[PDB]
Each structure stands twice: as C-alpha cells, then as structure tokens.
C-alpha cells in the first residue's frame, strides 16, 4: 500500500492516523511536580543512538528492514539532519525550488532516510492508559512502523506528529522503523531561503496518558480598563468515558502562593439547539492586581490543570506558564497592556554550524542572551514553528514572538499559484491550525503569522479568518501580495525604505512614512524584515530608528537576520572553515546569500551588532548646557538597575568623570546637571560621553553591562600657536629618474616616471613595499554586488557600474611632477589622470611639503567626472614594510564603522591589536574601516588630518579575488588605505542599489590633507 | 562676536617657485579671547598672470554656524555688464536655486541687486564656475554677489530708498553660503543640510585679467 499510494505526492494526504494537536503535555500524576515543572516519569525521551541507512529512493528500501535491523546500517545520534553526517549534500537555494516545479510530484530519485530504534517499554505502560510516540520534527515526510506493523504517516517538517502505539507495543523490547522522505508534496510549501536538509531533526518522545485524560486546554486572560483586575479563563477538554464524579481543578500560582483556584464538573454551557459540550468545562478565576507580563518584566504565574474524581483522586495533571498580558490594536496602534509597543526585533532561523537545523537548549539561551544584551525585545520565527523549548525560554526571559506557519511557496510563478488554489487549502490549513493548537498558551507569542513569500491567495484570507475566530487574543499578520492585504492586521512590509518609494507593479514597497497615510489606511506598520545585514551592512540603520521614534504608527521591525547560515567543513589538515552555498557540490545554489546575520554562525558578533544595540537603546539623551536630559522608552519598568556614567575628555585625554543614579519612570524624564566643567588651557575639542551601566547582574546580563551611550561635542579651542622654528632644512637631490629629499636620517623618494612617493627611509631601513598611490575603488561588499540569486546580474549594481566604467582597470597617467626648494621646506607637485578607453574618470592633483621638522604635508585635490558612477572611495593606499602589534588612533571606534553606519562608534583614543582591525566576513570584502579619524599611529608612523582608514595584512586586490575568508593569506608588511572620503555601505536590501544619496561621493571635486611624520 | 571679530595675523610668508611666486597666509578671528574662525591661504601667481587662491577655513564647533565662508573686496571699477557661467539669471541661494539654470548669463550691473524694501544680503548667484566684470575674471566653483552696496551699508540701512551707491563695486565671492530659510520668519528656519556645520571648509579661486 505504502509504495503503491505514494502519499508523498498528494497534497490531499498530509497525514494518516495522526493524533489531534494540543499544547505541551507531560501527564504528571503528581500535582506538585506539575506545578514546579519538574520531570514527568510519563514523558520519556527516545533521543540518542539510532540505526540509520540511506537509500536513493523509497523503492530501494528492502522489506526486511520493517522487522529486522539492516546490517549495513550505521549507528547515529538522533535528533539529526543526515546531511550533517555526510550521507548526502545539504543544498542552499534561495527562491528556485531544489526540485523540478511539477506539483504535486517529486523526483524519482528521492533521498530516503531509514531510521530504526530498538527500545524498552515497561509492562506498567501497557496494562492501562495510552502510549503515544511524538516526533517533534521530521523533514519532510515519513511513514512509521512499530514491530513490523504500519502505524501512520505525517507531513509538515516543523510541527510535532503524534501516534497511538498502544495496540502495537509489547512489554520489553520493541522496534520502531521510520522511513523519512527528503522530498514530498509538503516540499512545495517549504521553499524558505535556507539550507535544504532532511531527517529526524527534533526530539522523539514517548508519552503515557490515562484512558480518561486531558486532551486539550486553552488559557485566556482578560482585564479591566487599568489592568488592576483580571479574569483567567481556562477551557479544558477530556477524552474517555464521561462520569458524574469527574472534576477539573484549575489552580493559579504566583511562585509558591496559590492565588486562585476553581473546581467544576464537566458540562459546558449550551451553545446551540443540540446542547453543549458534555466533555468540556471552563473555569474562571478572578485575579486582583495581577503582575503583568512583558519583555521588560516577564512576570509569570503557573496554571495547574488537575483531572480528578470529586472525592480527591488525581487522574492526571497538565500545566503551563501563564503571562498576564493583553495584546490589541486600537486606533491604529499595537498595544501591549494598553501601551504602544516599539519592536526592536530580529528574524531568527534555527541554525547551528555543526548540527544544521537541530536546536539545543544551550544555543537557544546563548542567542536570547546576546539578543537582550543588544537591546532586542522581539523575534520572528522565520519561517516556521520553532522547537517547543524556544517559546518556554521566550516566556521566561521575556521576548515578544511572532509565531509563523511553515508555508513558503516563493519559487512558484506567480507566487500565489498554490495559495490561491482550493486544492491546496487543506495542506495549508494544517500548517496554520496545528501551530495555533500547539502554541496558543504561550504569553511570549503576541502575533500569529500565516507564513512567508507565498503571494496573496484566497487560502490566506480563509485562514486569517480562522485564527481571528479561534483566537481573538492575538493580531494576525502576513506580508505576501503587497504587505497590506486583507489577510493582515499589521502593514508588515519587507525592505520598504524610510523615505524612498519602490513603486513595483502590483506589490509596491512605499516609503514606510508614506505607507501609513495612504487614503483609507489606518493600520500600524512593523517591518517583518528590514536592514538586510549581509556582510558589511546595516548602513542607514539609524534612519529607520529616527522614523520609528517620530511616527506613532511606525512601531518597529525585525532585522534580517540573527545568524549567518554558514556550515563547518574541514580541509586536508582537518582544520575547520565556514562554508556557504555550492561548497557541498550542491547545484544550482545561491552561494553566500545564506549568510545575512548580525552574528557569525558561532555567535561571534559582526560589527553591525553594535550599531543595532545603539539604535535600539531604551534611554534617549539631550544636552542643554550642563543639563543632561534622560528619557526612558520603557513602557512598564522603572530604571531600577541603571547608573549613568559621564566623562569629559580633551582629544582623548580624560578631564573629568562621575556617576549619577538613574531613577526614571517608564516614559518619564530625569535632569542631570553636570558640575562646573573645567576649562582646558590646551587646544582641542572637548567631548562628553555618557553611558548607562547596569550595576546588578540579571537573568540575561552580567554586572556592569552597558545598555546605552551617547556623545556630544562640548567647547572647542582651535589651535593658533605656531610650531617651533626648525633649524634644519630638507635637501633636494634631483636626478633624471627620482626626486630624493633628505633631512637627517630620514629620506623620501619620488619617482619621476610614475609621479608617486616610491620609498621612504628611516636610517637605512626601507619603509614601503608598494608606492603611495591614489585608490578610488574598494573590494566589493555584498551590498555592492547586489545579488540575491546567483543566476541573476543587475546592471544597476554598484560593482557592475564600477566594472563597466573601468574603475577597477583604470591606469594612472602622469601629467606633472615638479620639485621646488622653499625657505624651510621642499615642495613636490604632482598631477595624475585615470583613464579608460579614452575617458578621463579621475584627476588627482597633489602637493607634498616636507619641512625641517620631518613632517610631510600631503594635500590632495581630486576631480571626478560627473557622468562616471560615483566612486567607492577617494583616498591613498600603500603597502608598508612594518608589521606592528598595535594600532592606536584618535577617531571613531573601537569597532569597524562606515559613514552610514557610525552612530554607535565613539570619538576617543583607541588602541587595539592589528588583528582586531580586520573583520573576518566569510565572504571577504572591504572591511575594518574607522571613520572621523584625526590621528593614526602604527609602528614608527603617524598620520594626522580628518580621514577614514583601514589597516590589515590583506590588500583590496586579495579581498576582491578571494571567495572564502579561510583562503586569505597574510601579505608582506601591512596594507594601509587612508581615505579622505568613503561611500556608504547601504543595506536597506542586498539585491539592488541601497546606498542613500547623501552617502554617495557625488560632489565632483574633493579635497583632503594628511600629515605623515615619524614618532 | 561674528560681526565684530578681528583678524589676527598668524603667518605671512613669500616664496619663489620655478614659474611662480607663492604667498602663504594664516589668520585668526577672535572675540573676547575666543577663536571663531581660522583662515589658511596660499596665493600662487604664475607666468600667465593668473593668481590661484586656495582657502582652508576652520570654524570652531561651538560657535554658531556662520552665514558665509568667502572673500570680499571693493573694486575700483564700475562696469556696465556682469557676465557669468553659473546658476541664473535671477538671484539664487543654496536652499532656493532649483528654478535657476546653469548657462552663460549676461546682465546689467543693477540687475545683480535685488531691491528688497528692507535691505539685506541679496543678489547671490550660486554654482558659478566663471565670473566676468570689466578686466577681471574669477574662476572656480563659488557663489557671488556684486553691487554698489557694501554688506555694512545694507545692515545699517532700514529702507531701500536710503541706500547710496558707494565708490566702485563691492564683490562678495563665497566658497559656501548658508541657506536663507523661510518656513517661517520668526524662528530659525534654515534646514540642517544648509547650515555651514562641517567645521572645515576648502575652496579655491583663480583671479586673472581678461
Ligand atoms: O525576503 C526575504 O529576504 C531574505 C533575504 O536573505 C530572506 O530570503 C527571507 O527569508 C525572505 O523573506
Ligand atoms: Mg502528501
Ligand atoms: Mg490540591
Ligand atoms: Mg523566500
Ligand atoms: Mg551619537
Ligand atoms: Na513609533
Ligand atoms: Na538569504
Ligand atoms: Na537606578
Ligand atoms: Na571577496
Ligand atoms: Na538692512
């Protein structure tokens, strides 16, 4: 029947013999164990060592496997993705399906994973009650046998499938056989932009329930106008024989105190002409002054549901954590406990670099900690229901959750081909309804989502209404078909820009500000995805946050995304490296487009994370004279774990500092008058830096955690004092090929054919390995490349425009090189033109003035043809002979910063190891720039001015020629790129030009000045 | 103290090059001991009689952003026409120049003055690459006004009919000029992107004889 029916090529069959969905059960037989959420002896884990064999098709699986272990089978850990054990390749594709688009059919060659487990069942489990097996995640479809007998079938890779094994088991040893299909009709609804894997990748458990049992329960909390009174309403359903003596007791607990309790027999109210539910009961408990749940203060109660005889016999108990909170949209605003939310959100895939799509508690906790430490309060489950533990942790640690159905049909043409088709309504409905049935009691879930990138079909509208009907407590959102359809309560676009319209036909992405006020529009707007964090990205992040704060109805967004989907591979020597699309022989593939994270796969932060943290701060600051005004953006909590530190420094030199306790109400203000500020005699800019410090450790943070900062310029005293009269004067030696300048042991060489400074000497020591030359290009960022599908090339992409214009191939042509002897200096004047196919792209005119103090003043004036694509940078570069341990600078830092991503950086004196000045993006590009630098120190060298710089062992050429970071080699000496000017990095998306006009180098004429000297 | 700031000489040197003379200057404008602006210049006069002026200005970050960054002088000459390659033909300012077109414009001198009943700074033309007046030509990328009335007289005179033509011609040539605003006229109304807030400014001009 199995091979004959081909249930995996039939959307009308998504399960066989699968039990109804429900909230998490453990069947405690002791109420105290239920209350305290301790282990239940009635819920067993079958995680561990299983037998596994791989086959190329289900037709290749031998019948013998149903009753006997296959000798060729291996013993593997479960849960697991079998690609991670090397049985076949994981496939990274974005939009295009990994299989031929021919619904409902899948390939004949359909990788088949045969799992089996021989396991013990106690006699006591079989003498009474019901023994079920629960598969929390099987990707993508499976048949199940127990002791050679066929049990059932299941689809949907991301929700639990449960089966009654009572009639199949024997006391002692039993054998399960699970046949997992890689591809099924379910795969058409699972086209998420992620690695395509398969297997038994979530927990497997065995649950014992009594014959008379709790089969479902729903918890709701409703409130009066000021939230000083609540009613908890618990609906409980039973299965078994109905009897007069049966009762349900629901008890509610605030830690160790029972705050409320209610007991009732079964028999619901009359609902229609045929009566009511005799197998259900609703308990209503009054709660005065409930402690409310939010991400800020995740107050939780425990609800215990006891099924019992009236005279006191507990049959079984179930339980959940209860968060007292109201979610509603009123007058166009999303409210949590009557207050408008500001969503500091991120999308988070379930991804581990070693284990693939298998999740563990440690990784989940690590992620939540890092998120909260970086000022996130919300997470979107892109794009499927998560491992059940995720919700428990979000409940307890406090994060707002968008729970999203496992439906994505991106690769369909058009996108709604399946979702507008009623033949596909049953399969879609199960992915939505079974999510709701499972997760509806979690307070952390505040919004339901219908899926992702499946267009807008009638099936979406039907399922939107289904949720609205069954669960009025939570808004429903869905972005497909233009982000503002009749299937969404929230305008939830992806990559809509702040100010710029993107008027695509049918599905425009309006400026978010404009979107709110379109005729007839009243809904709130929260971006489901924004600020695409691919590689060197998050340019213009502050622009979103300014808009969010100014516009009541712009209530935030979810950054895309949390973590790079890179996977670990090993080289010849067994050394690990980060791999992306195509690295497993997977083809077609979308290469690096799977890496979009604010953190690397091992959870090491990208530089972008600090920009996110800074913009997502909960305290706002204004400066008026000596007055600092602190404003809290908290809705509920006081600043009861917050101290304000302040420091005033003159060009990095500390002049004063102190601390002031913060006592700020939610949404309130506090004025801090700074003491009489000292007047520095010395020249320079005074800078004020403030930081909010948390003196006490929390569940999510260490003592001393910095949660917020800001800087201001204070007084500036411009230097008017003259540099000391240098007694010596530099000697010019003129030859046919060189202009050589000497002053003591210092020597400079300017090549007369090239027109560049080709060498410097300190004593007899060479200082340069490559000459100091202008550079107008950068090793392209992923945003410059502007690709989302590897087959596609956008002629509009910055890298394409630069390449076509000849920026990367333009050669320096010398126009002028002269030397003049001054009264206290030697002056070298140069002019160069950069040309491609007879077209002059750039002209550089320079003076080098070396005086008797040993300093070399470099003045550069550059012309850029108005019709050439604006250049990536305007600066100089050289390869120094020096390799030094440290980099010291007075500029913005300490982390990597670019013109459109530098708000988080602070102006101070920074000192770091050379390695910290390189950002190891897995796909190499221009990296590690620091902006607003007035002084740079490296080895014996010092540069002064007002410039941007990066410094590393890797040239721009190597970076642009290398696809993987692990293939980079340290070059001789150190490559230095010093920029007068540098283009924004953008990132509003990574598949179209996204650098805003104000960050493009469009001025045509540029001036900058550097002083190079020794110290 | 912007209107009463006094120029203090920091540096004034002269050098001879292979085909030119180079004059280097530095000035500080101060008020009550506070240095508001520093102007560093080079004047390069070559064998073709062209005087290349390079100007680099520091503006104290805590002083209000200045109305303009430029040079002014009273020319001995009165000439009939003003001819320029830049935005025109009418008066235009950084935040009010979209109507203006880049072209070669030639007007009588009197049209380079706008007779606002209450006198103020007026007649500026932006985005100018070449200006011609009598024997003089200025080249660069600048804003300018040219008229018989000094900035001093304009600020001291309440009514246009009370203005008297001064000897010769007042020329104001700006590397940079602040927006004029106008969202209202009773509060600061110049948008941030039109305020002269960069701290360090660079402009260059060539003065020659035509
Ligand atoms: O539109 C999207 O942008 C992301 C780009 O990485 C990713 O593909 C998301 O799954 C998708 O919803
Ligand atoms: Mg099927
Ligand atoms: Mg009791
Ligand atoms: Mg997609
Ligand atoms: Mg700041
Ligand atoms: Na808002
Ligand atoms: Na992606
Ligand atoms: Na406090
Ligand atoms: Na690269
Ligand atoms: Na006046």
3-state secondary structure A333-363: EEEECCEECCEEEEECCCCECCCECCCCHHH
Dihedrals phi, psi of A255, to nearest 5 degrees: 55, -120
Nearest CA in chain B to A826: B17
Q: How many CB atoms lie within 10 A of CB A652?
A: 18
Of A940, A806, A775, A914, the residue nearest A869 (C-alpha): A806
CB A382 within 8 A of CB A557: no
- List the beta bridge partners of residue A773: A877
Q: How far apart are the first and last CA of chain A?
A: 84
Where along chain A do its domains lie? 1-210, 211-325, 326-616, 617-722, 723-1015
A859/A861 Cα distance (integer angstroms): 7
B79/B156 Cα distance (integer angstroms): 25
Taking the Cβ of residue B129 and every Cβ of chain A, the question of whether any pair is shorter than 8 Å is answered with no
CA A843 to each of CA A477, A798, A857, A1003: distance values in angstroms, whole numbers, following the listed order: 54, 21, 20, 14
A723-1015 architecture in CATH? Distorted Sandwich (2.70)
Q: How many CB atoms lie within 10 A of CB A491?
A: 29
Q: List all residues 6 or more positions away from A606 whose beta carbon is below 8 Å from its beta carbon.
A: A533, A597, A598, A599, A600, A919, A921
Whether the upstream peptide bond of residue A154 has omega within 30° of 0, thus cis, is no
Helix (H, G, I), strand (E, B) or coil at A320: strand
Dihedrals phi, psi of A364, to nearest 5 degrees: -60, -50
Taking the Cβ of residue A720 and every Cβ of chain B, the question of whether any pair is shorter than 8 Å is answered with yes
**Residue owning the nearest CA to atom 1 of ligand 1:** A494
DSSP for residue A188: G
Sign of CA dihedral A142, A146, A152, A158: negative
Residue A988 in tokens = 């509003």
The answer to the question of whether A580 is labelled as a binding residue is no
Cα angle, residue A554 at apex, residues A550 and A558 outer, rounded to 5°: 120
CA A218 to each of CA A23, A90, A707: distance values in angstroms, whole numbers, following the listed order: 8, 39, 37
Sheet order of strands, A684-694 included: A653-661, A643-650, A684-694, A705-717
Chain A partners within 8 Å of B61 (Cβ): 685, 713, 716
Experimental method for this entry? X-ray
A211-325 architecture in CATH? Sandwich (2.60)
Residue A641 in tokens = 């774990």
- Give kind and range of the element (H or E) at residue A375: none
Q: List all residues 6 or more positions away from B135 whose beta carbon is below 8 Å from its beta carbon.
A: B77, B209, B210
Nearest CA in chain A to B23: A822
CB A778 within 8 A of CB A926: yes
Question: A76-113 b/e with 16+ CB inside 10 Å = b?
Answer: bebbbbbbbbebbbbbbbbbbbbbeeebbbbeeebbbb
Helix (H, G, I), strand (E, B) or coil at A525: strand
The answer to the question of whether A223 is labelled as a binding residue is no
Of A428, A492, A493, the residue nearest A460 (C-alpha): A428
Is A863 known to be catalytic?
no
Residue A866 in tokens = 């108005």
Residue A639 in tokens = 């600043």
Q: Strand B136-147 and strand B125-133: pairing?
A: antiparallel
Of A709, A716, A710, A647, the residue nearest A686 (C-alpha): A716
Within A117-161, residue ranges assigned H as helices are 124-127
The topology (CATH level 3) of A326-616 is: TIM Barrel (3.20.20)
CATH superfamily, domain at A1-210: Galactose-binding domain-like (2.60.120.260)
Chain B partners within 8 Å of A827 (Cβ): 17
Taking the Cβ of residue B155 and every Cβ of chain A, the question of whether any pair is shorter than 8 Å is answered with no
Residue A640 in tokens = 């009861």
Helix (H, G, I), strand (E, B) or coil at A515: helix
Helix (H, G, I), strand (E, B) or coil at A371: helix
Contact B200 A946 (CB under 8 A): yes
B81/B77 Cα distance (integer angstroms): 12
CA B46 to each of CA A31, A211, A375, A814, A1010: distance values in angstroms, whole numbers, following the listed order: 98, 105, 61, 21, 26
Which residue out of A33, A529, A800, A896 is catalytically annotated?
A529
Chain B: nearest CA to A535, how far in angstroms? 30
Residue A899 in tokens = 């013109």
Whether the upstream peptide bond of residue B85 has omega within 30° of 0, thus cis, is no
- List the beta bridge partners of residue A666: none
A963/A927 Cα distance (integer angstroms): 14
**Residue owning the nearest CA to atom 9 of ligand 1:** A193
- CA of residue A897 relative to chain centroid, distance: 19
CA A790 to each of CA A534, A886, A902, B3: distance values in angstroms, whole numbers, following the listed order: 15, 39, 30, 62
A492 CA from centroid of ligand 6 (Å): 14
Sign of CA dihedral A431, A437, A439, A440: positive
A646/A829 Cα distance (integer angstroms): 47
Cα angle, residue B110 at apex, residues B108 and B112 outer, rounded to 5°: 85
- List the beta bridge partners of residue B130: B85, B139
Q: How far apart are the first and last CA of chain B?
A: 39
DSSP for residue A465: H
- CA of residue A944 relative to chain centroid, distance: 37
Whether the upstream peptide bond of residue B181 has omega within 30° of 0, thus cis, is no
Q: Which of A453, A483, A565, A785 to mutate to test the pocket of ligand 1 (most atoms within 8 A of CB)?
A: A453
Of A841, A232, A934, A787, the residue nearest B58 (C-alpha): A934
CA A551 to each of CA A275, A548, A622: distance values in angstroms, whole numbers, following the listed order: 50, 6, 19
Residue A790 in tokens = 């590897």
Contact A720 B13 (CB under 8 A): no
Q: Strand A327-330 and strand A333-336: pairing?
A: antiparallel
B113 CA from centroid of ligand 10 (Å): 14
A213/A307 Cα distance (integer angstroms): 7
Strands (E), A389-471: 400-404, 445-449
Cα angle, residue B39 at apex, residues B36 and B44 outer, rounded to 5°: 175
Q: Chain A interface, mutation test: which of B8, B18, B65, B69, most A Cβ atoms within 10 Å?
A: B18
- CA of residue A872 relative to chain centroid, distance: 27
DSSP for residue B194: G
Ligand nearest to the CA of A670: 8
Strands (E), A723-810: 731-734, 738-743, 746-751, 757-762, 765-766, 768-775
CB A617 within 8 A of CB A545: no
- Identical fold for domains A211-325 and A617-722, yes or no, is yes
Q: Strand A199-200 and strand A15-16: pairing?
A: unpaired
A193 CA from centroid of ligand 1 (Å): 6
The answer to the question of whether A593 is labelled as a binding residue is yes
Q: Is the CB of A452 under 6 A from ligand 1?
A: yes
Helix (H, G, I), strand (E, B) or coil at A63: helix
Residue A733 in tokens = 């030696």
Of A350, A343, A302, the residue nearest A475 (C-alpha): A343
Helix (H, G, I), strand (E, B) or coil at A435: helix
Q: Is the CB of A529 under 6 A from ligand 1?
A: yes
- List the beta bridge partners of residue B103: B86
Is A529 known to be catalytic?
yes
- CA of residue A934 relative to chain centroid, distance: 33
Residue of A685, A827, A946 lying closest to B61 (CB–CB): A685
A283/A5 Cα distance (integer angstroms): 46
Nearest CA in chain B to A1003: B141
CB A249 within 8 A of CB A200: no
CA A704 to each of CA A376, A640, A644, A695, A709: distance values in angstroms, whole numbers, following the listed order: 18, 14, 11, 5, 14
- Which atom of ligand 1 sits closest to the CA of residue A594? 6
Cα angle, residue A200 at apex, residues A194 and A202 outer, rounded to 5°: 75
Cα angle, residue A831 at apex, residues A828 and A833 outer, rounded to 5°: 155
A617-722 architecture in CATH? Sandwich (2.60)
CB A607 within 8 A of CB A896: yes
A892/A874 Cα distance (integer angstroms): 19
- List the beta bridge partners of residue A692: A644, A708
Q: Which residues does a gap of C–N over 2.5 Å follow in chain A?
A: none
């Amino acid at each position: 029947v199995v091979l004959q029916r081909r249930d995996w090529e039939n959307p009308g069959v998504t399960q066989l013999n699968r039990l109804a969905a429900h909230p998490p059960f453990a069947s405690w037989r002791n109420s105290e164990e239920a209350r305290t959420d301790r282990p239940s002896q009635q819920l067993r884990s079958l995680n561990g060592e299983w037998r596994f064999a791989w086959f190329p098709a289900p037709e290749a699986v031998p019948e013998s496997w149903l009753e006997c272990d296959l000798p060729e089978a291996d013993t593997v850990v479960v849960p697991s993705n079998w690609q991670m054990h090397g049985y076949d390749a994981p496939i990274y594709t974005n939009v295009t399906y990994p299989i031929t688009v021919n619904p409902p059919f899948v390939p004949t060659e359909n990788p088949t994973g045969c799992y089996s487990l021989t396991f013990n069942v106690d006699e006591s489990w079989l003498q009474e009650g019901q023994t079920r097996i629960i598969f929390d995640g099987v990707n993508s479809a499976f048949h199940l046998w127990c002791n050679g007998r066929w049990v059932g079938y299941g689809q949907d890779s991301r929700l639990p499938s449960e089966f009654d094994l009572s009639a199949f088991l024997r006391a002692g040893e039993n054998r399960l056989a699970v046949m997992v299909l890689r591809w099924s009709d379910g795969s058409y609804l699972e086209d998420q932009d992620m690695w395509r894997m398969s297997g038994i990748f979530r927990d497997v458990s065995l649950l014992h329930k009594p014959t008379t049992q709790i089969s479902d329960f729903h918890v709701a909390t409703r409130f009066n106008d000021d939230f000083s009174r609540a009613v908890l309403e618990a609906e409980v359903q039973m299965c078994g024989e109905l009897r007069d003596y049966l009762r349900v007791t629901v008890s509610l607990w605030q830690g160790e105190t029972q705050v409320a309790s209610g007991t009732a027999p079964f028999g619901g109210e009359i609902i229609d002409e045929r009566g009511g539910y005799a197998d259900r009961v609703t308990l209503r408990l009054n709660v005065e002054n409930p402690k409310l749940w939010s991400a800020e203060i995740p107050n939780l109660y425990r609800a215990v549901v006891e099924l019992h005889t009236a005279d006191g016999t507990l049959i079984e108990a179930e339980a959940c954590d209860v968060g007292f909170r109201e979610v509603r949209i009123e007058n166009g605003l999303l409210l949590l406990n009557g207050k408008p939310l500001l969503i500091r959100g991120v999308n988070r895939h379930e991804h581990h670099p070693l284990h693939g799509q298998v999740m563990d508690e440690q990784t989940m906790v690590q992620d939540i900690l890092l998120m909260k430490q970086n000022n996130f309060n919300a997470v979107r489950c892109s794009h499927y229901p998560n491992h059940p533990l995720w919700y428990t942790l979000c409940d307890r640690y406090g994060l707002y959750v968008v729970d999203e159905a496992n439906i994505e049909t991106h690769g369909m043409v058009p996108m709604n081909r399946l979702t507008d088709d009623p033949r596909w309504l049953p399969a879609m409905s199960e992915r939505v309804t079974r999510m709701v049935q499972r997760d509806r009691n979690h307070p952390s879930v505040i919004i339901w989502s219908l899926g992702n990138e499946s267009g807008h079909g009638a099936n979406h509208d039907a399922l939107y209404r289904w949720i609205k009907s069954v669960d009025p407590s939570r808004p429903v959102q869905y972005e497909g078909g233009g982000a503002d359809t009749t299937a969404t309560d929230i305008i939830c676009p992806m990559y809509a820009r702040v100010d710029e319209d993107q008027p695509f036909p049918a599905v425009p992405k309006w400026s978010i500000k404009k979107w709110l006020s379109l005729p007839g529009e009243t809904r709130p707007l929260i971006l489901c995805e924004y600020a695409h964090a691919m590689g060197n990205s998050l340019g213009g992040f502050a622009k979103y946050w300014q808009a969010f704060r100014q516009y009541p109805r712009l209530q935030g967004g979810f950054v895309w995304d949390w973590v790079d989907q890179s996977l670990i591979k090993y080289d010849e020597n067994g050394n690990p490296w980060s791999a992306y699309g195509g690295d497993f022989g997977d083809t077609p593939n979308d290469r690096q487009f799977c890496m979009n994270g604010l953190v690397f796969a091992d959870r090491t932060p990208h530089p972008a994370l600090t920009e996110a943290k800074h913009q997502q701060q909960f305290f706002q600051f204004r400066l008026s004279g000596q007055t600092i005004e602190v404003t809290s953006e908290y809705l509920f909590r006081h600043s009861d774990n917050e101290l304000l530190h302040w420091m005033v420094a003159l060009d990095g030199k500390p002049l004063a500092s102190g601390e002031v306790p913060l006592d700020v109400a939610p949404q309130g203000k506090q004025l801090i008058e700074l003491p009489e500020l000292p007047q520095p005699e010395s020249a320079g800019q005074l800078w004020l830096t403030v930081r909010v410090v948390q003196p006490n450790a929390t569940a999510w943070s260490e003592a001393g955690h910095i949660s917020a900062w800001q800087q201001w310029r204070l007084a500036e005293n411009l230097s008017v004092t003259l540099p000391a009269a240098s007694h010596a004067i530099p000697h010019l030696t003129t030859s046919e090929m060189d202009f050589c300048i000497e002053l003591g042991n210092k020597r400079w060489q300017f090549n007369r054919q090239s027109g560049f400074l080709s060498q410097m000497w300190i004593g007899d020591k060479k200082q340069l390995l490559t000459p100091l030359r202008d550079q107008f290009t950068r090793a392209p960022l992923d945003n410059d490349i502007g690709v989302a599908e590897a087959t596609r090339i956008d002629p509009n992409a910055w890298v394409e425009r630069w390449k076509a214009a000849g920026h990367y191939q333009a050669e320096a042509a010398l126009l002028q090189c002269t030397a003049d002897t001054l009264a206290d200096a030697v002056l070298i004047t140069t002019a160069h033109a950069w040309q491609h196919q007879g077209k002059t792209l750039f002209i550089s005119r320079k003076t080098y003035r070396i005086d008797g103090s040993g300093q070399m003043a470099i003045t550069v004036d550059v012309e850029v043809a108005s019709d050439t694509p604006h250049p990536a940078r305007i600066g100089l570069n050289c390869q120094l002979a020096q390799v030094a341990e440290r980099v010291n600078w007075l500029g913005l830092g300490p982390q990597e910063n670019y013109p459109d991503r530098l708000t988080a950086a602070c102006f101070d004196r920074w000192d770091l190891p050379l390695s910290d000045m390189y950002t190891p993006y897995v796909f190499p590009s221009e990296n590690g720039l620091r902006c607003g630098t007035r002084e740079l120190n490296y080895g014996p060298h010092q540069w002064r001015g007002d410039f941007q710089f990066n410094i590393s062992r890797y040239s721009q050429q190597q970076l642009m020629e290398t696809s993987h970071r692990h293939l980079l080699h340290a070059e001789e000496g150190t490559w230095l790129n010093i920029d007068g000017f540098h283009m924004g990095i953008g990132g509003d998306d990574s598949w179209s030009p996204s650098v805003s006009a104000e960050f493009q180098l469009s001025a045509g004429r540029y001036h900058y000045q550097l002083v190079w000297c020794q110290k």
